[PDB]
Design a protein around this ligand. Structure first.
Ligand code: CA
Ligand code: CA
Ligand code: CA
Ligand code: CA
Ligand code: CA
Ligand code: CL
Ligand code: NA
Lengths: 283, 290
């Protein structure tokens, strides 16, 4: 049990009846291991249980669910408070598991629980948008069958390039953009690689601008072709300022955000997270 | 026919009084080497002497001048279908000599003259645009306003490109697997790598790959991007690179191009490489060779 600090588990209602997990937890609770369990029903709950988690003094808050749940927990975990925030643990259960997957967290439910409770925690970055919202994995923006891939990666339907200005460290670009990709992580919308170089502990944010009228084929392209594609502009910076005369809307790991101005900054080592010793996203 | 096949030097008038050159030629002519000399005065002469070089059965026609002179000779040489045309020889003369420079030919006349005569020949490319004008080195185009009625980036813009003020404008560009559209400031399409005295527009370019290199500069300024390293360039969002055997340029608002000096305006440009269209005597360690 010394190898298993206490832990509160925030579980998405969509898995509230997942028996195999119930059994795994029951076993662990048998060795004197403390594992609290809470289940969310809507947005806002995660925050509530992370707060109880702090009060309970647990060392780990495990997010059980998809990227949306990881984001809500992580967000609540970086909230400026009194005392040392618990570390973040990952238990992939949602349909959308991009971050968890990209980070290399075990498929085996029981094997992921061990990592989330016993694993060592590495400090990692986080992106903040307009000082109000956050995201740990990916932000994608655009203006306005294979449609499922377009709507699966974003709340968009039929994209159209519109004008927007973008600034960052040693970076200034302007023109018509179809899709703006800013990642802390590397993939989104179910396996689609967008910022293949991203590292979650470098203090940077990978930017990827897709120009032109087409997009899907670029997506199915190799890393060699995408590099020769004049309609793909890569960038990297701790921050980015986006200005779009016509309202652009981003998708922050599931949560929509619209507007004409976006300030995006990395919050270096904002939270600890139990990742495998050889995580692909780690410097 | 030997270590020094007979050659015919096409000396651009502006350098007819060069004493050192005359001194070199004379010494080689003493050693039994045969070097015919013809000096141009205006457009058309180069072609007239290339025809004469043919009748004299020389194995090399040496362009004694800048990129402009090299173009005139190459363009005439490229038109020879009857058997084997003479190889192109290079000299470091003329105001604008970016090609010879980038090719790494000797700065010393006596040395460069010997390479131009005895050096080995290699098949190289040439670009042709709109079925009328060719170029062996670089084609640059700028959007904005032409010069209306001396050095560095200022020379390239106001001098070579003969531009008053550069101002981004819309243009559409197509290539084998290339299709970009948007506001552009300056377009560089080269068979060679530099123009305007040193300015490296298409650093990767090779003269025997059967491809052309494209560099699109976007954004409001040109100077800063021109002083970037080979890396800052690959990371510059306003610099776009492309390679293709051909390129179609469409500029809604008449764009002005510059093919090794001679201008060619219009709103439509088709550029295509002519793979190994000519042989050119080059030094073994030539940076432009694949
Ligand atoms: Ca604190
Ligand atoms: Ca990062
Ligand atoms: Ca690219
Ligand atoms: Ca070439
Ligand atoms: Ca670039
Ligand atoms: Cl979820
Ligand atoms: Na030259």
């Amino acid at each position: 049990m010394a190898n298993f600090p206490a832990s509160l588990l925030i579980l998405n209602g969509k898995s509230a009846d997942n028996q195999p997990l119930r059994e795994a937890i029951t076993l662990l609770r048998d060795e004197g291991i403390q594992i609290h369990v809470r289940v969310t029903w809507e947005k806002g709950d995660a925050q509530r249980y992370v707060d109880e988690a702090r009060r309970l003094g647990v060392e780990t808050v495990i997010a059980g669910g998809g990227d949306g749940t990881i984001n809500e927990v992580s967000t609540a975990l970086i909230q400026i408070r009194d005392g040392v925030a618990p570390a973040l643990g990952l238990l992939p259960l949602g349909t959308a598991n991009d971050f968890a997957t990209s980070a290399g967290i075990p498929e085996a439910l029981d094997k992921a629980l061990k990592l989330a409770i016993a694993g060592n925690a590495m400090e990692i970055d986080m992106a903040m948008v307009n000082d109000k919202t956050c995201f740990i994995n990916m932000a994608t923006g655009g203006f306005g069958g294979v449609s499922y891939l377009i709507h699966g990666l974003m709340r968009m339907d039929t994209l159209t390039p519109d004008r927007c200005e973008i600034r960052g460290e040693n970076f200034h670009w302007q023109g018509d953009a179809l899709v703006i990709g800013i990642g802390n992580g590397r993939q989104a919308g179910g396996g689609q690689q967008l910022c293949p170089t991203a590292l979650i502990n470098d203090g940077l944010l990978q930017l990827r601008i897709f120009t032109g009228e087409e997009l899907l084929p670029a997506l199915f392209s190799t890393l060699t072709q995408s590099d020769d594609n004049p309609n793909i502009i890569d960038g990297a910076s701790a921050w980015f300022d986006i200005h779009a005369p016509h309202e652009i809307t981003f998708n922050l790991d599931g949560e929509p955000l619209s507007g004409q101005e976006f300030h995006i900054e990395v919050l270096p080592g904002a939270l600890r997270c139990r990742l495998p010793p050889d995580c692909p996203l780690l410097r």
